[PDB]
Symmetry: C4
Subunit: 388 residues, 4 copies
């Protein structure tokens, strides 16, 4: 077995093609299925897995009530092959109310954060063993990506934050080999607030697009130099911004450098990635709520501030249906590294109060250099058919 | 690992022997089992899998209602080892309301079609990665085999149609290596309408027997030359025709060349295969409805128009029980390539209106050169014992 | 991978030690568990599997009613790792209302009989492929061991019967290589009626102890010469006889040669094996009903007619609890071939009429050359706690 | 494959980090989950498994009643990957109302004890085969560790007791190679009563910390010399004692040598391990009941009698929540052997009489040389949401 280097060029993409869907909520009305949120996808070579933070209960179960307390000690990181819904045979890989996982080519790394808000612990589990742990540096919800980390030549990087969700916080970028923390770099550069980073390999380095929960409806970007541990940061240039909430398209802005001070707080986990001067990005359709999901390319959107010329739009979820978090993962093909993304389809609270629980299903799409059509792939459950 | 070539002669067959049965509907009355239709079987060397298009729900689940809308965004391709019913641990391999899968000797290819009727996407998933995609060329339900594709020396072929279900359409034959489309040949020859092809290796080439939904109750045949991408087509010679609906045996015909204009529309997915001048074929027992299932050999049925001398008949399902789609798969033994087939046993709508759902079980038989007796292997559920 | 030869001496045994128990019926009152009967155990090297004939339904399911019609087309052979109860993820390996399985060192052989009573088919499935089939030779319930077959150097032998259950029938011994029947020897010697053989390797040959359903409460024995296909047969010498029904111990007999004409019909599947002049054997405790289960050694019981001096008795199931079929399997250890046995614990019909179904759990014991104590390991379900 | 030697130094530990949690009881309110008690953890290299003694039933099942009869013939040893709750697909590895398991680097050893209290049998299952068995030597509940055994260079050791739970008994230490007992050493030294040992590798030997159920609330220690089979024994020096019941911290004692005669009977399974002159240990928070769980290091606690200076305390379960048994397991990392522990979280009888059953969930922590914070990780079920 060999370490992944991801040393191929990024695939050409013309858009995205449907890849996977788990139908979790529909199934939960006639089967024992885990209550989850904050899902993601990561792959051991070409074999892809779905992950989520469990609420320590199934859906048709009185313990499903009030999974709006985001951090309890019952929460565990679930891991199944992609497309296998979270049934009762699902492995709980670690104790976690925040996580990130990734495979280095030889084994799985899981970063799992649990415990008290003011004094949390992160456990680093590598090839099934507990190798390292760190306590909270700012005593205010030590927390991480909720999507895949990335490893290059045996070194894995993960972004973590500790401190305020609505003011300056303390973000650090960890470098980890075989589960062991070998270096920690504080955040540097012009990003002013970092949450829930969606990271990808850009060989020899890593790049992340995150969520600013303080002043920005434009998404921050982090560049992680794997050879010297140097961090820089800025904001995606596109004037079509990726966060929710945000201004409408005619009055949204980004200068590439600073938070835009437009509906800055709070936010939603999301992603984008560069292709030369252009950016491919997803976002909720609604500017206000986590409703709908669309992807498009912004011409000049990576290098020209305030660019708003989109092309290759695709609806992933129509705006009559609920979305949620979204994130990037990468898959190395024969000749190029592809980019894929998942969308969390949140059902139940706070937007659907008939039920008392909150859970999600997923839909997943991957980059394509071929052709495609149109559609919409929402959760599909009828809230009136659900146990409450 | 090496590519399959299937370069052995076809096995001698005297008829078929019982191979597999999943009892899906019986179990659905006391267990959480997927609602499915359009099943098939395909094997990774000798290890055989059952596939179907899920309806995004289990049977005992209010979401089971009205799975007569054949194409929704909840539909996913399920894949289990043959004989493992579609329980909640079943992997949803792709998003699909039409599919075909096959193993090239090194990995699995899935062809998955989803999205809007007028602008569908097909995704090509190979070894678990999205490698290619194509959009609809005629904007009218891009669709494929609902049974296994076939690969020879690393090149896989699949038949797809886009356009009218009851008039001339646009059928193309794709050639795919490691998930990538390398060539596309339009249909050519005298077949006038193609649906739901049942294809098999006939080394060095592939042969398919399909469904004509327009003018033919005789089944069209497609020959796919793997070395030069040349396509020819015609109709099975046998005067005992394989489609449903059809004329009764005394007044059914086929000239080997054209649709017979006997009860031409619609049809049912089915199969047949050649042995020298004779044809082995299945069909529903009823000429009108998808009831019963029988197999037999027609002497001269491959090369002599209107031949009606059958022999070696076997009842698979008696005519008091529901059948459905059927298809071919091939299995390479020590010395010869065998032919096998599955029958979809459809329960619920439209023929059984007590329930509101529609789902299926399967029975599976393989060619034998030994001896055998008689029986009937229907679904076996009692519709009055089912949740509605 | 290499063929099993089983070419080590039989282990010394002082009795048997507890090995496995599945608790199937207890679990069926709070879980979806298959209705089964006729279980057995066979091992791929040291990895052991449990097998049974399913009734095409779970227990808490209205289709569980009247599983006293022993042969229907819903019956399939289930196969799980030993100790894994028959949950909804269980693989249905073939269509079968009678079976035998065995592993040749390279792959699994399953012999599966289904279809009409008067014209049944047996399918021979090897490494997951249908390799051969035979039809009924006497048109009266072609049927087989319901326990493991045995393979030596790539040749597997299985005993089958076709004809009367209460008069002379036609028993044949099949020799099968890679799923293909290569020879068939009619039964020969003094056994007069053969059912449900429990067979084991006695290198270079195989030996079986069966059930006589016609005139014998003594068990018949079959010796199968693997080098020349020669069959001989006789009866276990022990005057403590192994069938049920039988005379009480003071008035039971066997002359080693003929059926004893004591309560000859019907019978129960069982086992015994030789150790020099002595026999180790199990049997129901009750002489009349399938209640209780005991093992013991009979001194001179292999070679001296009417020997009744037992020693090393063990209760497996006390006589207040239901038993059922029992059978032998063998496991090769470091230095010797061990003998093990399972007992079917039948619950529900005809002895427990509160429920309408009939199903079983299992208990399993293996030979030991160490020491042991006492106990009783019955099914343990409370019939009043079961769905009906 | 090679035998484990565990020949690396013990890892530095600063405390423990969260590792695993199964949420068994919460899930049992909305899913079919095994009723268990006496869980433990053991790992095949870095791949960790959870084990427990099943009660032959799921929780939502009328058979769940009165699982306070600790030893019945329905009890089996369950084995799943760590973090996979005991769902209906769980394998029952042996028949057991007391057990110990361990992996020698090549295969799994299970020590399983079942049968009558006065004449029990222990079965020794290695690589899936029954290799040996021993009967009861004192005819009074032959019994063992309820946590992992330990193997060095192919020889596995396990501690067993037979005789009184409240007076002198007969404890022996078995040495087993490939499932075969090769030596048995009686207990020797100053420990006066041994139950439920928690053992770990201390290369080239093994060390155990057990439960004294007779006169001691200090925990006995056993040292097992693997080269010469020599046994010595004593008591953990710490004046902060590990058993429950016990005196409060101001009046608890231990002289390193004898039972302390402080609330000597009964006890709870627990663990401790040495680091030079200091001891790391867990215990219930309550001195009286199996409530809460804490870990800490006692300075001089290994070598100085009555030392009470603790440091590095961690709450694992707060004192408002139920605990239970706890035990040690060891995991070899790149450079050192780590120590981990599990806590059984018992719900239902006798402390929670609303329900009629008794079952448990688990939480699991591993040693760390990094940093960490605080929290509490109790079972988390609401007893009023459970079926009774
Ligand atoms: C079957 O399926 C295919 C594949 O999904 C689908 O084709 C895709 O259609 C969409 C929608 O038309 C295309 O995406 C749009 O692209 C245009 C720009 O492309 C054109 O113009 C530039 C010149 O600048 C050329 O280079 C280029 O080659 C094209 O001529 C964007 O302008 C679109 O964005 C606007 O419209 C969206 C709604 O469609 C809005 O959501 C978005 O916010 C934008 O609107 C805003 O800007 C407008 C001014 O531009 C303004 O008028 C609005 O009010 C608002 O302020 C969008 O990105 C996509 O590229 C097609 N993909 C491919 C590969 O061809 C087919 O349409 C479909 N078939 C059928 C029958 O429907
Ligand atoms: C135990 O199980 C075995 C194996 O399943 C079973 O044997 C099989 O029996 C069937 C039924 O008889 C056989 O299949 C039939 O074969 C005949 C042709 O074979 C004869 O004639 C030709 C001469 O041309 C010889 O070469 C040959 O050797 C035979 O002598 C077909 O004619 C049959 O088809 C007709 O009958 C079917 C009903 O059985 C109809 O469904 C079908 O539509 C055909 O009827 C039509 O054609 C007739 C004119 O031919 C006309 O009269 C009718 O009205 C109608 O228009 C069928 O293919 C099969 O080959 C046997 N298989 C083997 C391997 O031997 C046993 O019968 C069974 N045992 C018992 C006791 O039942
Ligand atoms: C803890 O657990 C152990 C292991 O399970 C257990 O030891 C086992 O006990 C049983 C029961 O005693 C033993 O099995 C019996 O063996 C005797 C023969 O052995 C003795 O005699 C011969 C001389 O011929 C010596 O060679 C030998 O070494 C012994 O001295 C059998 O006679 C027994 O069978 C009769 O009794 C059974 C009931 O126990 C009946 O079911 C059976 O039908 C037999 O009864 C019939 O025959 C009798 C005449 O023999 C007649 O009187 C009756 O009415 C009837 O017609 C049985 O096979 C076994 O060997 C022991 N195993 C070992 C390894 O030692 C301990 O007993 C147990 N501890 C406690 C406290 O109970
Ligand atoms: C975020 O999370 C971290 C990591 O969990 C946590 O830090 C940990 O705090 C605990 C609690 O303070 C520490 O454990 C205690 O250690 C002291 C000893 O350490 C001091 O003293 C010695 C000098 O001997 C120095 O070597 C050392 O460096 C320290 O200065 C123990 O005394 C503690 O035990 C007592 O208190 C416990 C309650 O906390 C009682 O349960 C226990 O029974 C002991 O009390 C008894 O003894 C007392 C006499 O000593 C007596 O007064 C009492 O009445 C009673 O009889 C305990 O072991 C631990 O080491 C810290 N860990 C690390 C790695 O730093 C943070 O506190 C947390 N953050 C926040 C904001 O809370
Ligand atoms: C679950 O959670 C909430 C909080 O406990 C419950 O909502 C309360 O229900 C009670 C009793 O019906 C009311 O008196 C309160 O006014 C409700 N509180 C709130 C904040 O709305 C809810 O009832 C529970 N749901 C279920 C299904 O058990
Ligand atoms: C499933 O779907 C169909 C369509 O929604 C429902 O059938 C209707 O039921 C209503 C209310 O009982 C009737 O008034 C309509 O006449 C029915 N429509 C048709 C087209 O027959 C059906 O009721 C739903 N079934 C279940 C079990 O919910
Ligand atoms: C299942 O099987 C048997 C046969 O159908 C049923 O027994 C009959 O029940 C009916 C209606 O209650 C009675 O009138 C008959 O006298 C019964 N027949 C016999 C042969 O006893 C039984 O009721 C069915 N059981 C269930 C639970 O559905
Ligand atoms: C579970 O087991 C116990 C013992 O059988 C049962 O407790 C008894 O219940 C009966 C009937 O309600 C009472 O009259 C007795 O006084 C109870 N006995 C004791 C010792 O308390 C209990 O009822 C059974 N529980 C269930 C749910 O069936
Ligand atoms: C990968 O890391 C190794 C080990 O430190 C180093 O020697 C090697 O140069 C690296 N490979 C690349 C492609 O940078
Ligand atoms: C299989 O394809 C390879 C690679 O292109 C080719 O060189 C070879 O000739 C082919 N084999 C056969 C049997 O046609
Ligand atoms: C096993 O069978 C082979 C192949 O036919 C034969 O040559 C060989 O002698 C046999 N081995 C034994 C031990 O009989
Ligand atoms: C392990 O056991 C082997 C086989 O008996 C022995 O020869 C060898 O010396 C042992 N290794 C160690 C490290 O003691
Ligand atoms: Ca924001
Ligand atoms: Ca037609
Ligand atoms: Ca008999
Ligand atoms: Ca004590």
């Amino acid at each position: 077995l060999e370490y992944r280097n991801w040393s191929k060029p990024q695939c050409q993409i013309t858009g995205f093609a449907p890849f996977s869907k788990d139908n979790s909520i529909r199934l939960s009305a006639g089967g024992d299925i885990w209550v989850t949120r904050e899902p993601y996808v990561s792959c051991d070579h070409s074999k892809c897995y779905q992950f989520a933070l469990g609420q320590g209960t199934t859906l048709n179960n009185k313990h499903s009530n009030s999974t709006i307390h985001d951090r309890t000690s019952h929460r565990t990181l679930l891991m199944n092959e992609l497309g296998v819904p979270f049934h009762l045979g699902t492995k709980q890989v670690c104790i976690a109310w925040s996580s990130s996982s990734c495979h280095d080519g030889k084994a799985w790394l899981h970063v799992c954060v649990t415990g008290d808000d003011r004094n949390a612990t992160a456990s680093f589990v590598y090839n099934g063993m507990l190798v390292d742990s760190i306590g909270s540096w700012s005593r205010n919800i030590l927390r991480t990506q909720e999507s895949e980390c990335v490893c290059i030549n045996g070194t894995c990087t993960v972004v973590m934050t500790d401190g305020s969700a609505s003011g300056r916080a303390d973000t650090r970028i960890l470098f980890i080999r075989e589960g062991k923390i070998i270096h920690i770099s504080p955040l540097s550069g012009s990003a002013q607030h970092i949450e829930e980073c969606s990271c990808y390999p850009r060989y020899p380095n890593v790049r992340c697009v995150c969520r600013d929960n303080w002043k920005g409806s434009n998404r921050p970007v982090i560049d992680i130099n794997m050879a010297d541990y140097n961090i820089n940061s800025s904001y995606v240039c596109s004037g079509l911004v990726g966060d929710t909430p945000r201004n409408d398209d005619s009055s949204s802005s980004s200068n590439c450098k600073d938070p835009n001070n437009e509906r800055g707080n709070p936010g939603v986990k999301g992603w984008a990635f560069d292709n030369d001067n252009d950016v491919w990005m997803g976002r909720t359709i609604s500017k206000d709520l986590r409703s709908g999901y669309e992807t498009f390319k912004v011409i000049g959107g990576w290098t020209t501030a305030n660019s708003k010329s989109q092309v290759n739009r695709q609806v992933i979820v129509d705006n009559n249906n609920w979305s949620g978090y979204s994130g990037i993962f990468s898959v190395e093909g024969k000749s190029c590294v592809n980019r894929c993304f998942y969308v969390e389809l949140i059902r139940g609270g706070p937007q659907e109060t008939r039920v008392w629980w909150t859970s999600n299903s997923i839909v997943v799409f991957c980059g394509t250099s071929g052709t495609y059509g149109t559609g919409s792939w929402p959760d599909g459950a009828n809230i009136n058919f659900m146990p409450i």
